[PDB]
A paper describes a structure:
Part of the initial identifications suggested a specific SAR between the function conferred by an individual gene and aminomethylphenoxy derivatives, mediated by the methylamine moiety shared by the compounds. This gene encodes a protein, [name] that potentially functions as a trypanosomal FALDH based on our crystallographic and biochemical characterizations. The monomer structure comprises 485 residues from A6 to K490, and adopts a canonical ALDH fold that is composed of an N-terminal NAD-binding domain, a catalytic domain and an oligomerization domain embracing the second subunit of the dimer. Interestingly, this C-terminal structural element strikingly resembles the ‘gatekeeper helix’ that is unique to FALDHs and is involved in regulating enzyme activity and substrate specificity. Moreover, the difference in MS between M1 and M-A1 correlates well with the transition from aldehyde (-CHO) to carboxylic acid (-CO2H), as well as M2 and M-A2, suggesting it is highly likely that M1 and M2 are the aldehyde precursors of the carboxylic acids M-A1 and M-A2 respectively. These data collectively support the notion that MAOa-[name] can metabolize the aminomethylphenoxy derivatives in a stepwise manner, i.e. the methylamine group in the structure is first converted by MAOa into an aldehyde, and then is further metabolized into a carboxylic acid by [name].
To understand the reaction catalyzed by [name] at molecular level, we obtained crystals of the aldehyde-NAD-[name] complex. A micro-reaction chamber was designed to serve as a physical barrier between the two reactions as well as to minimize the reverse reaction; meanwhile, a cysteine to serine mutation (C259S) was introduced in [name] to entrap the hyperactive aldehyde metabolites by abolishing the nucleophilic attack on the carbonyl carbon of the aldehyde. The NAD cofactor is located in an extended pocket rendered by a Rossmann fold. There are two hydrogen bonds formed between E365 and the hydroxyl groups of the ribose of the nicotinamide, establishing the key interactions between NAD with [name] in addition to an H2O-bridge that connects the carboxylate group of the nicotinamide to Y444 and T200. In this structure, the benzaldehyde benzoxaborole substrate exhibits distinctive electron density, being nestled into the substrate funnel and adjacent to the nicotinamide. Specifically, in the catalytic pocket, its aldehyde group directly contacts the catalytic residue (C259S), and also connects to N128, a residue whose counterparts in other ALDHs are involved in the catalytic activity by directing the carbonyl carbon towards the nucleophilic carbon on the nicotinamide. Noticeably, the position of the substrate is relatively flexible as indicated by the B-factor.
Numbering used by the authors:
A (entry chain A), B (entry chain B): 6 to 489
């Protein structure tokens, strides 16, 4: 118990070769079949919500309610959306035609691609393996899924339960870390969706080139939060939204607030408002125990039993504790090694060249930098990689529009964080080293489909026949010259 | 004269670094600037149409009227379309929202990506270097272009003329073959558009992974033509369209008729109709000379002065002459080595395992296979790579729809060939080993742009705040349970 079986290398081609045949044999082509399968994955989630929450707790130490909001309900809404709008999404589109081809009958049809690979990640292990899967299967593909090994209990359970609802020839499973994942990537797929680090994204895309496979890459970077000096009266909402977005999963969220850029005059009030938000959300007893101002008979036991989630492993814990040395610990600072607990920490007087402000934090550390004018914002943000998310807290329509226009990022949100990702009708995806492609809803269906142009002509005379057919007469030249 | 100067490896980073700065300095951001630049490229083409036709003749031995129809006028129409619809295309789109986020203000903005690399190919050297370029610049990118070295005169002239209209810091030039092109691909770009072979596409995409650069890959394969037994009365139109599509560029066109699949009873009538179409288009004197039934004082001279185009080099000539040994020469067969002339040839009694029916022909050889029923069509077509183009000649609504549904290809055309590629309002691109991504018009602008979601919220209470913020109370659990 605890982990899934590492898939044998001999079986990895067998698993992909079976899904190939399935796709080829029309296993998931017809709309009746796609809806059954999308319904069976709704049952998987709805009937075992309890067990999944318990599994995701053992891996992440997330609370059931945190998990319900962040994973369970977004996956229910995705299944609902895709069944409701499938008949809309399959149907051909009449493009607007211009010039000669406007006399013809033209059409954009959507057709499946074939076998899709989903490679997943540990921080939201169900959501980030199944939400891609729903989209692939909604578009008439068959699929192979590779769960993160850094959430073994969630990989174990899903491996246990998924084949009771959906057959392995329709949705295949491969478990393991680097070796098992390198073997699968040697196999031919028609689209790969990958979530993870840019470093590993380069190796996937290198694998994808072997077979010319289109990739959708869901990556990270340092999502900035810009706070201006028009939010004074709302500072408690600004603080609670930014602190919520960081507290969730102990910061280990790709769209979380990575650092803040605050207008020089609003620094003190934001920081203090973040500290009160923090205290409200983590609760008094918890922070006293972590700090050591209150003793408990079984300290390790108590932290493992808390509402606050853990860091994934010892290496990322230590990395995050060394980032504290890149500034002044204004708020927080508290950690415990044996339960991989690091409470949210706000750092001031940042050396902007320190690793904490060069690499993605992906943890509870939140640096706070200031800006006197808009151009100091732009040299901070645009000197770095294009981030997955950009956040602006402001009531000024000029200041918001000016920051949008002058920066590039996966998404912008004005006056909140994170929630755009759950929003029905927006694509979710990066740009530059935050990624390429997008998915969710219509955009997963569009991503996992080939848009196929179809032109219908008759056998009768039309404009084009005056100039196309050789021989190239002098009369044909004088007609074409007259156009130029 | 003849060729451009091979770009020095020391200058290749300098050239890309200059376009980077340009993009970064807003060289092509504002709409006034993009339209000037698109107008200056209209002037480039319009004012030097003559010289380009002469250059493209020396490389391809294509007639000025062939070139005007296939390259000059499609590039004029593209410039036209992009200036006319730019103000449409820049504008944000209001996606349809559902659930919670429908209370907010949501938006899809389009923003430039940065520096775009266009790698070109020899067979339509101007069209397939500039049409990508127009789309990149219409989307607010700056650009680097790499002309095929297998059309040196067209590369020379464009290198001569392009910087007189548009500055090198806005549109950079790199000339050379394998070495120069490997050096450029070591540099960072924000999108690559490549036209060429799937073999070399894999090496480009491998380069693109180094920097996580999104690729649009414009490739080939064997575009089938399916002829049924409902076209008897129209056989002269069917034959002249298929023979036109092959005659152009001596077959060296990625969307040309590669082979035919004819219903068993219509074989003789199609083949003979293709032979009469061939004779009509290439003219009697030409074919007699080529065959040797009519002599001329300077044979080599006469063929170099003809309207029929040449094979790119000796290697592809010999390859195409060995394909004649994969069947019976029903129509044609005639060749001359010193002018790299191979007249269109129809082969019957094909060994379907012979290289002529395994690899892309890209030449004047046209195999003809038969089918008794629809499933014989499907095992021919679907046993091979997904092709760029699929063509169906038919008047039966059931037979057409059945072939569309059961095959995958870059585009379908019913009752013609090639022209879909010039059609305003369809995307042009492949699928599988015919390619990924699409361009032309709106679709080039969409390809060379990041679609950026933007969510705007207010600071007041809303649906989401009932469940998101910790601490995780029992009252918060009972609210979330009631939803499940
Ligand atoms: N935008 C999103 O949807 C999203 C969501 C979650 C996380 N992320 C990003 O993920 C990033 C990194 O998380 P991580 O570093 O724990 O990811 P990771 O290292 O766990 O990688 C993810 C997947 O890649 C596989 N992998 C690891 N090394 C490999 C190799 N050498 N070859 C092949 N496969 C390999 C793993 O098995 C795993 O399934 C974060 O920085 C975050 O920003 C993005
Ligand atoms: N769909 C389309 O738009 C389209 C249009 C024209 C041609 N094509 C296809 O492209 C192919 C054209 O033939 P081709 O094979 O002569 O193209 P090609 O081999 O000349 O490749 C195109 C470009 O790649 C470069 N190149 C060649 N080898 C390289 C290497 N090792 N590293 C880096 N760069 C390299 C060349 O300099 C050239 O500019 C055909 O198969 C045809 O079907 C497709
Ligand atoms: O790390 C990346 C990531 C991406 C998407 C996530 O899914 C959410 C779905 C719905 C909602 C939220 C989040 C927050 O509020 B929602 O309504 C969570 C994490
Ligand atoms: O081999 C690949 C390829 C790709 C695109 C081509 O450009 C065309 C543009 C416009 C038109 C056509 C063709 C035919 O009629 B048109 O008006 C030609 C060849």
């Amino acid at each position: 118990a605890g982990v899934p079986e590492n898939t044998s290398l001999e079986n990895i081609p067998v698993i992909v070769s079976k899904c190939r045949e399935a796709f080829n044999d029309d296993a998931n082509r017809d709309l009746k079949k796609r809806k059954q399968v999308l319904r069976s994955l709704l049952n998987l989630v709805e009937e075992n919500t309890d067990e999944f929450c318990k599994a995701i707790h053992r891996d992440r130490r997330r609370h059931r309610d945190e998990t319900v909001v962040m994973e369970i309900l977004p996956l229910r809404n995705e299944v609902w959306h895709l069944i409701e709008h499938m008949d809309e999404y399959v149907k051909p589109v009449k493009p607007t035609m211009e010039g000669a081809a406007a006399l013809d009958d033209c059409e954009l049809q959507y057709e499946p691609l074939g076998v899709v690979l989903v490679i997943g990640t540990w921080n939201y292990p169900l959501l980030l393996i199944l939400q891609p899967l729903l989209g692939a299967l909604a578009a008439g593909n068959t699929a192979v899924i590779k769960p993160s090994e850094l959430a073994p209990a969630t990989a174990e359970l899903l491996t246990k339960l998924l084949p009771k609802y959906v057959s392995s020839d329709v949705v295949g499973i491969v478990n393991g870390g680097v070796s098992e994942t390198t073997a699968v990537l040697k196999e031919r797929f028609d689209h790969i969706l990958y979530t993870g680090s840019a470093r590993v994204a380069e190796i996937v895309m290198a694998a994808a080139a072997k077979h010319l496979t289109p990739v959708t890459l869901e990556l990270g970077g340092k999502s900035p939060v810009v706070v201006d000096d028009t939010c004074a009266d709302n500072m408690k909402v600004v603080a609670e939204r930014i602190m919520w977005g960081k507290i969730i999963n102990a910061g280990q969220t790709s769209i979380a607030p990575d650092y803040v850029v605050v207008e020089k005059s609003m620094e003190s009030v934001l920081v203090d408002a973040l500290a009160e938000a923090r205290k409200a959300m983590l609760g008094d007893k918890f922070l006293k125990v972590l700090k050591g101002e209150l003793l408990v008979k079984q300290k390790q036991q108590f932290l493992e039993e808390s509402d606050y989630p853990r860091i994934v492993n010892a290496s990322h814990f230590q990395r995050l504790m060394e980032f504290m040395k890149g500034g002044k610990v204004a708020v927080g600072g508290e950690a415990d090694e044996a339960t991989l607990t690091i409470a949210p920490t706000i750092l001031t007087n940042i050396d902007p060249t320190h690793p904490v402000m060069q690499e993605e934090i992906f943890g509870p550390i939140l640096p706070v930098l200031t800006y006197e004018n808009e151009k100091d914002i732009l040299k901070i943000i645009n000197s770095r990689e294009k981030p997955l998310a950009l956040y602006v807290f402001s009531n000024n329509k000029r200041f918001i529009r000016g920051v949008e226009s002058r920066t590039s990022s996966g998404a912008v949100v004005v006056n909140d964080v994170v929630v755009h990702a759950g929003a029905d009708g927006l694509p979710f995806g990066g740009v530059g080293r935050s990624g390429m492609g997008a998915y969710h809803g219509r955009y997963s269906f569009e991503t996992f489909s080939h848009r196929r142009p179809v032109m219908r002509r008759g056998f009768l005379f039309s404009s084009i026949d005056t100039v196309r057919f050789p021989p190239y007469t002098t009369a044909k030249s004088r007609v074409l010259n007259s156009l130029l």
